[PDB]
Enzyme design. Structure first.
Site, PDB file in Angstrom:
ATOM      1  N   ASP B 121       0.896  -1.170   0.000  1.00  0.00           N
ATOM      2  CA  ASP B 121       0.000   0.000   0.000  1.00  0.00           C
ATOM      3  C   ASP B 121       0.935   1.222   0.000  1.00  0.00           C
ATOM      4  O   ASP B 121       2.065   1.079   0.491  1.00  0.00           O
ATOM      5  CB  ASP B 121      -0.850   0.016   1.265  1.00  0.00           C
ATOM      6  CG  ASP B 121      -1.764  -1.177   1.360  1.00  0.00           C
ATOM      7  OD1 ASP B 121      -2.399  -1.494   0.339  1.00  0.00           O
ATOM      8  OD2 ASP B 121      -1.860  -1.788   2.446  1.00  0.00           O
ATOM      9  N   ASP B 123       0.720   3.970   1.768  1.00  0.00           N
ATOM     10  CA  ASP B 123       0.892   4.448   3.122  1.00  0.00           C
ATOM     11  C   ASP B 123       1.704   3.596   4.093  1.00  0.00           C
ATOM     12  O   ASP B 123       1.555   3.768   5.293  1.00  0.00           O
ATOM     13  CB  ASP B 123      -0.482   4.737   3.723  1.00  0.00           C
ATOM     14  CG  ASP B 123      -1.312   3.473   3.938  1.00  0.00           C
ATOM     15  OD1 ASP B 123      -0.781   2.329   3.810  1.00  0.00           O
ATOM     16  OD2 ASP B 123      -2.510   3.634   4.255  1.00  0.00           O
ATOM     17  N   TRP B 183     -15.398  -4.083  -0.741  1.00  0.00           N
ATOM     18  CA  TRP B 183     -15.983  -4.508   0.523  1.00  0.00           C
ATOM     19  C   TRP B 183     -15.041  -5.311   1.422  1.00  0.00           C
ATOM     20  O   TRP B 183     -15.452  -5.843   2.468  1.00  0.00           O
ATOM     21  CB  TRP B 183     -17.300  -5.253   0.293  1.00  0.00           C
ATOM     22  CG  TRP B 183     -17.276  -6.058  -0.912  1.00  0.00           C
ATOM     23  CD1 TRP B 183     -16.470  -7.122  -1.153  1.00  0.00           C
ATOM     24  CD2 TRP B 183     -18.021  -5.819  -2.119  1.00  0.00           C
ATOM     25  NE1 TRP B 183     -16.655  -7.558  -2.442  1.00  0.00           N
ATOM     26  CE2 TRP B 183     -17.601  -6.776  -3.059  1.00  0.00           C
ATOM     27  CE3 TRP B 183     -18.999  -4.884  -2.498  1.00  0.00           C
ATOM     28  CZ2 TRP B 183     -18.121  -6.832  -4.365  1.00  0.00           C
ATOM     29  CZ3 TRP B 183     -19.516  -4.936  -3.793  1.00  0.00           C
ATOM     30  CH2 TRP B 183     -19.073  -5.904  -4.709  1.00  0.00           C
ATOM     31  N   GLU B 186     -10.382  -9.304   0.611  1.00  0.00           N
ATOM     32  CA  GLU B 186      -9.503  -9.733  -0.490  1.00  0.00           C
ATOM     33  C   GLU B 186      -8.147 -10.267   0.003  1.00  0.00           C
ATOM     34  O   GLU B 186      -7.576 -11.208  -0.566  1.00  0.00           O
ATOM     35  CB  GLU B 186      -9.235  -8.593  -1.484  1.00  0.00           C
ATOM     36  CG  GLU B 186      -8.039  -7.741  -1.116  1.00  0.00           C
ATOM     37  CD  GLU B 186      -8.356  -6.657  -0.053  1.00  0.00           C
ATOM     38  OE1 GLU B 186      -7.392  -6.143   0.551  1.00  0.00           O
ATOM     39  OE2 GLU B 186      -9.554  -6.311   0.164  1.00  0.00           O
ATOM     40  N   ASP B 187      -7.639  -9.665   1.063  1.00  0.00           N
ATOM     41  CA  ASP B 187      -6.379 -10.098   1.580  1.00  0.00           C
ATOM     42  C   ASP B 187      -6.617 -11.370   2.367  1.00  0.00           C
ATOM     43  O   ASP B 187      -5.712 -12.179   2.530  1.00  0.00           O
ATOM     44  CB  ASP B 187      -5.730  -8.969   2.421  1.00  0.00           C
ATOM     45  CG  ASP B 187      -6.599  -8.512   3.590  1.00  0.00           C
ATOM     46  OD1 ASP B 187      -7.797  -8.201   3.351  1.00  0.00           O
ATOM     47  OD2 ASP B 187      -6.073  -8.462   4.736  1.00  0.00           O
ATOM     48  N   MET B 213       2.753   3.870   9.508  1.00  0.00           N
ATOM     49  CA  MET B 213       1.712   4.231   8.572  1.00  0.00           C
ATOM     50  C   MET B 213       1.786   5.751   8.387  1.00  0.00           C
ATOM     51  O   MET B 213       1.852   6.506   9.347  1.00  0.00           O
ATOM     52  CB  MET B 213       0.314   3.858   9.059  1.00  0.00           C
ATOM     53  CG  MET B 213      -0.701   4.130   7.970  1.00  0.00           C
ATOM     54  SD  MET B 213      -2.335   4.565   8.575  1.00  0.00           S
ATOM     55  CE  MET B 213      -2.246   6.395   8.813  1.00  0.00           C
ATOM     56  N   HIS B 216       0.305  12.105   8.936  1.00  0.00           N
ATOM     57  CA  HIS B 216       0.851  13.395   9.321  1.00  0.00           C
ATOM     58  C   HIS B 216      -0.029  14.150  10.313  1.00  0.00           C
ATOM     59  O   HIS B 216      -0.758  13.528  11.100  1.00  0.00           O
ATOM     60  CB  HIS B 216       1.116  14.266   8.078  1.00  0.00           C
ATOM     61  CG  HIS B 216       0.743  13.611   6.786  1.00  0.00           C
ATOM     62  ND1 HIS B 216      -0.561  13.305   6.454  1.00  0.00           N
ATOM     63  CD2 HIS B 216       1.502  13.210   5.739  1.00  0.00           C
ATOM     64  CE1 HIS B 216      -0.590  12.747   5.257  1.00  0.00           C
ATOM     65  NE2 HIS B 216       0.648  12.678   4.802  1.00  0.00           N
ATOM     66  N   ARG B 218      -1.300  15.089  13.094  1.00  0.00           N
ATOM     67  CA  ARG B 218      -1.144  14.483  14.405  1.00  0.00           C
ATOM     68  C   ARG B 218      -2.281  13.531  14.732  1.00  0.00           C
ATOM     69  O   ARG B 218      -3.036  13.742  15.691  1.00  0.00           O
ATOM     70  CB  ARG B 218      -0.987  15.530  15.514  1.00  0.00           C
ATOM     71  CG  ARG B 218      -0.247  14.963  16.736  1.00  0.00           C
ATOM     72  CD  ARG B 218       1.098  14.286  16.340  1.00  0.00           C
ATOM     73  NE  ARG B 218       0.926  13.149  15.430  1.00  0.00           N
ATOM     74  CZ  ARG B 218       1.567  13.007  14.267  1.00  0.00           C
ATOM     75  NH1 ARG B 218       2.437  13.930  13.873  1.00  0.00           N
ATOM     76  NH2 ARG B 218       1.308  11.961  13.475  1.00  0.00           N
TER      77      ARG B 218
END
Ligand SMILES: O=c1ccn([C@@H]2O[C@H](COP(=O)(O)OP(=O)(O)O[C@H]3O[C@H](CO)[C@H](O)[C@H](O)[C@H]3O)[C@@H](O)[C@H]2O)c(=O)[nH]1
Ligand SMILES: O=c1ccn([C@@H]2O[C@H](COP(=O)(O)OP(=O)(O)O[C@H]3O[C@H](CO)[C@H](O)[C@H](O)[C@H]3O)[C@@H](O)[C@H]2O)c(=O)[nH]1
Lengths: 271, 271
Positions: B121, B123, B183, B186-187, B213, B216, B218
C-alpha cells in the site's frame, strides 16, 4: 438569481454544545424565513439543490429540539432549498431505520420536486458548515468524523449517521432495504448496494466532516469501535427485491409543525 | 560481480517521520542512480532479486511522495534489481485493490524479467532495512508490526499491507481475486489461496518487521485492528476462476516518471 458555488454566509468551524436546553418557540423565533413544515427557499439566489432531509424518528423529541436548533441556521447558510421530514415509527416493536428512510423519500416527493436526499439520525450535528448538506457526483457520507468515534471513521466503508443521495442515485439502488429491523447492518447493506451499482462514496475531509453526537450530561466515553457486518452475498441476492419496489406502509398521520413535517406511519412488524 | 547474502549497506533501525513535507525533485536529486520509471540495478554485485514493487493507487499523491522518499534509498541499500509501479484506478467506482495489483503483475512483466513481486500500500514504510523487500521460500508478509496497530500482528492469518510473492508463487494461486470491489476480505482470500496451494506464510520478526503508517498532522491515536472476514469456502470455490486467468482491463496511459512508472487503467465495474 442563480446561486454561487460556495455560500458567502459560511462561518466554517462552529461551537456545538448541549448543556443549554432549548425551546422550539425560540428556534422558530430565531429562524423567521422558515415557512410551515420546515421549508426554506433562498430568497435571493436560485439554488440547484432541492434537498429533503429525512430523519428516522421514535421517542427522541429532545434530540430533535437540539437538531433543529443547529441545523436550520446552517442549512439556510448553505443556501439550500430544503424541507425537514421526521418519519415517526408508530409501534412499540423493533425500530426499522432504513425503512423509515424509504418512507421519507416517498412522502417528501409528494410535496416537492426534491432532487436530493439527506438521511440523518436525529442525534448528529455537523461542526463545520463547509460540510454541505447537498448531493454530489457520487453518494455522500457526511458524518465522516464523529466525536463519539474519536473523530475517526470506524472503517472505510462506514456509511452510517448522515448521508446524501440524489434521487437518481437513490432509485438506482432500489432505495434501502426494509428487512433489517434493528438487527444491524443496513448501512453496510446500503454501501454494498452502491458498490454493486458501480458507485463509490464521496466524502468531505476529516476536518470539515467533524460531527457531534447529541449527548448531554458529561459524556466523554468513546463508543466502542463499530464493526462491519459481512452480508455481501445477501445484498447482491436481495437488493433488487427489498427496497423501494417492495415498500409497504400506512400513513397514520401528517403534522405540519412550524419547523419540520412529522409523518407518523405504521410499517409493520418483523417476520 | 555476484551479490552477497546480507547487504553491507544495511543501517538497521531507522527514523521514520512525516512532519517534513517533501519534494520529488529532491528525491530524484538524492537518489541519482535511479533510472527512468523508478528502475535501479546494483552497479557492483549481481542481484538474484529482480523485484517489481506494485502499488495500488488512487488520489494519494501525497503518500506516494513520502513512500518514494523513504523506500528508494532502502531498496538500493538491500541491493535489489527493482522497479516501481503505481497502478492507478481511473474509474470513480469502488476502489479495487487486488485487481490493480493483478494489473501491476501483468504490466511489469512487459518491462523486465522480474521474478519477484512486492505488493505494498502507498501508506506503509518499513522501520528497519533488515526487512528485505524480496521474495522467500514461501510467500512473505512484510508489514508485520505496524505502529497504528500497536506494532502487533492483527492475527496470524493477516496478510494485508505489504507482502511479496515470487512469480511462481503468484502464478500458483491464479494471482489475486478481481471480484472484491471495495468490501474487503480480499487479503483474507489471498491468504486462503496460499493455504490451498500448499504454501505457508513467512515473516520477519516483530522487531525488524516494524512499520509506520503515513499519518501526518497528528493522528497519533491507535487504529482499530483490521477485521478478519470469513471467505474460506468462497475461496476454495472461486480461486481457479477469479484471478490472473479472468483478468480484463484497458491501459488508459503509461507515464515513465523519474522515480516510478505510473499506469492508469480502466478496470471495469462490478457484477
Ligand atoms: O427507538 C429508537 C431508536 C433509534 N432512533 C433513532 O434512529 C437513528 C439511530 O439510532 P440508534 O442506533 O441509537 O443510533 P446510533 O447508533 O447513532 O446509530 C437516530 O435517529 C436515532 O435517534 C429513534 O429515533 N428511536
Ligand atoms: O480511494 C482509495 C482507497 C485506497 N487506495 C490505496 O489502496 C490501499 C489501501 O487503503 P485502505 O485500507 O485505507 O489502506 P490502509 O489503512 O493501509 O489500510 C493503499 O495502498 C492506497 O494507496 C487508494 O489509492 N485510493
Amino acid at each position: 438569481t442563480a446561486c454561487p458555488e460556495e455560500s458567502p454566509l459560511l462561518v466554517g468551524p462552529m461551537l456545538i454544545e448541549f448543556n443549554i436546553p432549548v425551546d422550539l418557540k425560540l428556534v422558530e423565533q430565531q429562524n423567521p424565513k422558515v415557512k410551515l413544515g420546515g421549508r426554506y427557499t433562498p430568497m435571493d439566489c436560485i439554488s440547484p439543490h432541492k434537498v429533503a432531509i429525512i430523519i428516522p424518528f421514535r421517542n427522541r423529541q429532545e434530540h430533535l429540539k437540539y437538531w433543529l436548533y443547529y441545523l436550520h441556521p446552517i442549512l439556510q447558510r448553505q443556501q439550500l432549498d430544503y424541507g425537514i421530514y421526521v418519519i415517526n415509527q408508530a409501534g412499540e416493536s423493533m425500530f426499522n431505520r432504513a425503512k423509515l428512510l424509504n418512507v421519507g423519500f416517498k412522502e417528501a416527493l409528494k410535496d416537492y420536486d426534491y432532487n436530493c436526499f439527506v438521511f440523518s439520525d436525529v442525534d448528529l450535528i455537523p461542526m463545520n458548515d463547509h460540510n454541505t448538506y447537498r448531493c454530489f457526483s457520487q453518494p455522500r457520507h457526511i458524518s465522516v468524523a464523529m466525536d463519539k468515534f474519536g473523530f475517526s471513521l470506524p472503517y472505510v466503508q462506514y456509511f452510517g449517521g448522515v448521508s446524501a443521495l440524489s434521487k437518481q442515485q437513490f432509485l438506482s439502488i432500489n432505495g434501502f432495504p426494509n428487512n433489517y429491523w434493528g438487527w444491524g447492518g443496513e448501512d453496510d447493506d446500503i454501501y454494498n448496494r452502491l458498490a454493486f451499482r458501480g458507485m463509490s462514496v464521496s466524502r468531505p475531509n476529516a476536518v470539515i466532516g467533524k460531527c457531534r453526537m447529541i449527548r448531554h450530561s458529561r459524556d466523554k466515553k468513546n463508543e466502542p469501535n463499530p464493526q462491519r457486518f459481512d452480508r455481501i452475498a445477501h445484498t447482491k441476492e436481495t437488493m433488487l427485491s427489498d427496497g423501494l419496489n417492495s415498500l409497504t406502509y400506512m400513513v397514520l398521520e401528517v403534522q405540519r409543525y412550524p419547523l419540520y413535517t412529522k409523518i407518523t406511519v405504521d410499517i409493520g412488524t418483523p417476520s
